[model samples]
Target chain A: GVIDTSAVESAITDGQGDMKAIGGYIVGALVILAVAGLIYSMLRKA
Target chain B: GVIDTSAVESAITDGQGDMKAIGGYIVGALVILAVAGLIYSMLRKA
Candidate 1:
């Protein structure tokens, strides 16, 4: 049984970390875009 | 060795799926909020 459970766990953990990083980036971008749009609209009215 | 690799794989897969679903929901909510903010700005000008 050369199955390395530790390696498998590490791989999964790494994948989870990547997923979280990507999720954060997406949320951040959305928020920034939203704010920018609002500001643009306000500026247009002035 | 009573270790079941199939079960381990399935668990990891399920976890990844959950992460993806949650990410999708977050992105969706952010988009909705962004749109709502834009509409509110437009309404305020009227």
Candidate 2:
């Protein structure tokens, strides 16, 4: 019975924060890629 | 002078939507992986 509930709670919070950070980075990368693709397409058709 | 403003606008809208969709998929996968890692770590010490 050595389980620390607070430790578990802290770990969960850390995981959630990291998840949100990773999510933002992923979205940022995808947006940049889409913009690049859009520009490239426009140039090709110009 | 054949630039189609409406076409460009439409393209941008489509591109943003696609980017958002792709972002969601990536975030989803990352979330799964994070959760798996979290549980694995917890179990390792169990």
Candidate 3:
């Protein structure tokens, strides 16, 4: 519910937020692209 | 500093318990997938 979605910290100079285990992002990105593509395809068809 | 960092389990279901990582990621592809997929478009968008 995003009950407290506030800025946790100021942005670092590298544009890297606090959570910087970015290797984990490859997994997240694949999911986003795969899911987005699926939704786009399905919604477009409908 | 508002830091009551609690594990407030959500009203959200479709959960993944067991944060127990026992081996290298590929060793248990299915288990990795089960947790990862449940956290996916099958979860966030998933």
Candidate 4:
């Protein structure tokens, strides 16, 4: 049986797109955490 | 002026959820790549 190379290609393409989006998510979460930490730390110091 | 700590708390909570989702996406992409690599290897050997 011939292998469906097209499916594999699709998977690789889609996976790369998803991975990039996930990178954005990671950045967003870290930014939120960083900001929150700063706010709390300043509050404690005040 | 008093800071709204409740807003910060909500941001931290929501950010954690988003971070967890990003983790799932990363794992999914890795699994896709791993399976694809395995398939390609087997095809080459065949």
Best by lDDT: 2
lDDT of 3 by residue, B1-46 (tens): 2333233343222122211222222244445445555555453553
Q: If you score just chain A, what TM-score does every candidate get?
A: 0.66, 0.75, 0.41, 0.64
- Kindly indicate the candidate among 1 and 2 with the higher lDDT: 2
Please tell me which model should have the higher DockQ, number 1 or number 3.
Answer: 1
Off by over 4 Å in 1: A1-46, B1-3
State the lDDT of candidate 1 residue by residue for B1-46, as single tens digits. 1144445545565665565566556666667677787899999999
lDDT of 4 by residue, A1-46 (tens): 2368878888999999888666656666665768666555543543
What is the Å distance of residue B17 in model 4 from its true position? 0.7
Model 2 lDDT per residue over B2-45, tens place: 13334445556878776667666767888999999999999999
Give the per-residue lDDT digits (tens) of candidate 2, residues A3-44: 798789889999998887676556655655667796565445
lDDT of every model, 2 decimals:
0.62, 0.68, 0.42, 0.67
For candidate 3, the per-residue lDDT at B9 reads 44
TM-score to native of every candidate shown = 0.42, 0.48, 0.26, 0.43
lDDT string for model 4 (B1-46, tens) is 0123444566777666655565667678789999999999999999
CA-based DockQ, model 2: 0.04
Docking class of 1: incorrect
RMSD of each: 10.6, 29.4, 17.4, 30.3
TM-score-based ranking, best first?
2, 4, 1, 3
RMSD of 4: 30.3
